[PDB]
Structure 1
Amino acid sequence: AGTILLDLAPEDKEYQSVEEEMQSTIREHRDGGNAGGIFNRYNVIRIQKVVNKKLRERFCHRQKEVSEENHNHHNERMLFHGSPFINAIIHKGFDERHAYGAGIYFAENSSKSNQYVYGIGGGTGCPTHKDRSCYICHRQMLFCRVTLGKSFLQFSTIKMAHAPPGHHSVIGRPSVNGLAYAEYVIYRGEQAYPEYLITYQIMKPEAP
């Protein structure tokens, strides 16, 4: 469907709120930066608002259904999503049929989503230099509206095909000797809208 990308100005409070969420949710991973690279900050290049009529209709229709089922609590959250398929998502929307557990995954930590931008485990890194820690190539991630409804809380790895009865999402919570970062899972593509398209670089730490 026909998508319009609206550029946000760095002086706008909306652009600043998105950047602040992205910068403040960075964590150090157990990985040592193997999947996403070594950095403590991003360089934000562009923040674009995604406008798609058909995707907004599917999203709003699903949100109303979830709110009705969950005593008027749709429990919407803004969460990050990193993937090599950003172009398909902003035009056709999120699709659970591509998941390959089996649901659509989001993170509350931008650094978690950054590990998936080039593929699982960071794939082979950027197309040009084949570098998972590339400081040059422009990466993209989404900051999405996610309809969570009633969330089912667990510590184990999410090995479910659908949300349990009475629930609309699954949350994998960090625990000592378990997950390092929280994972948010939905099983219907209509329960996420790709609101913001963020273009950025990971920054190389200063030399002592």
Structure 2
Amino acid sequence: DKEFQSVEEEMQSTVREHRDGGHAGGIFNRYNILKIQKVCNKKLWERYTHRRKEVSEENHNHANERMLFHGSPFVNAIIHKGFDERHAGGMFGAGIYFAENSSKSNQYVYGIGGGTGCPVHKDRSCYICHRQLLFCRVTLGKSFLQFSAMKMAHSPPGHHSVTGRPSVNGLALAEYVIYRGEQAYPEYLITYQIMRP
């Protein structure tokens, strides 16, 4: 399957060396991809496409959709109930955060800063336990570009998302923030392990 090889390639090629030396997400240069499942939730898909059409109409007939990663200990709840801003602290406030680098999303799979790592071994660098990440369709619409912390409750006026851009004093890598759960669809569920270098 070419569609699934495309997802594996995005997962592998977007890995970066992290500033925390692997503290949050573990030490690795690549993953062992175990499974890639396409999520088919009709109710969530229509909530997503309905919002996407509204955003496109408010953004010069352009949804500004991107495929982005999301790491969370609550992936199962997300694939069933969708993203939920009511469950959203954060550099850009009360939003739902996505990354274009899979290894950045991997830092959130076991909690903020990697939490205490895997449930079985309490290891943020566990090579044994299988992890899950989502590869999502995200509607950014008119995205507000920001470099420094800007604690928002909602998108800035006239905007549909916030894009955090890398800066000397700030972010190492980009991040994308939405403030309405219906602006993302959890399209692929990736089951994987981080691999020992």
Q: Is TM more than 0.5 here?
A: yes
**Are the equivalent residues in 2 in contact too, given 1:103–1:185 (CA < 8 A)?**
yes
Matched ranges for 1:124-203 at <5 A? 124-203=116-195
CA contact under 8 A between 1:158 and 1:172: conserved in structure 2?
no
How far did residue 73 of structure 1 move?
0.7
Deviation at 1:57? 1.1
Counterpart residue identity of residue 162, structure 2: V
Give the letter aligned to residue 2 of structure 2: K
Offset of residue 94 of structure 1: 0.2
CA contact (8 A) 1:142 1:194 kept: yes
State the TM-score, normalized to the length of structure 1.
0.92
Match of 1:86 among 71, 75, 84: 75
Name the amino acid aligned to 2:105: S
Task: Say which of 8, 18, 22 aligns to 1:33.
Answer: 22
Normalised by the length of structure 2, the TM-score is 0.97
Alpha-carbon offset, residue 178 of structure 1: 1.2
Structure 1 stretches of 4+ with a deviation exceeding 3 A read: none
Tell me the matched-pair count: 194
Aligned partner of 1:113 in structure 2 is 105
Q: Aligned partners of 2:46 and 2:19: how far apart in 1? A: 40
1:159-193 Cα offsets, whole Å, 9 max, x none, are 11111111100011001121111110000000000
1:56 is aligned to 45
Structure 2, unpaired ranges of 5+? none
Q: Secondary structure at the residue paired with 2:188? A: strand
Point out where structure 1 has 5 or more consecutive residues left out of the alignment.
1-11
Q: Which residue does the alignment assign to 1:73?
A: 62
- Mark the structure with the bigger radius of gyration: 1
CA apart distance, 1:134: 0.2
Q: For each residue in 1:107-139, what CA deviation from the matched residue of structure 2 results, as whole angstroms up to 9, or x when unmatched?
A: 000000000000001011001101000001000
1:99 aligns with 2:91: no
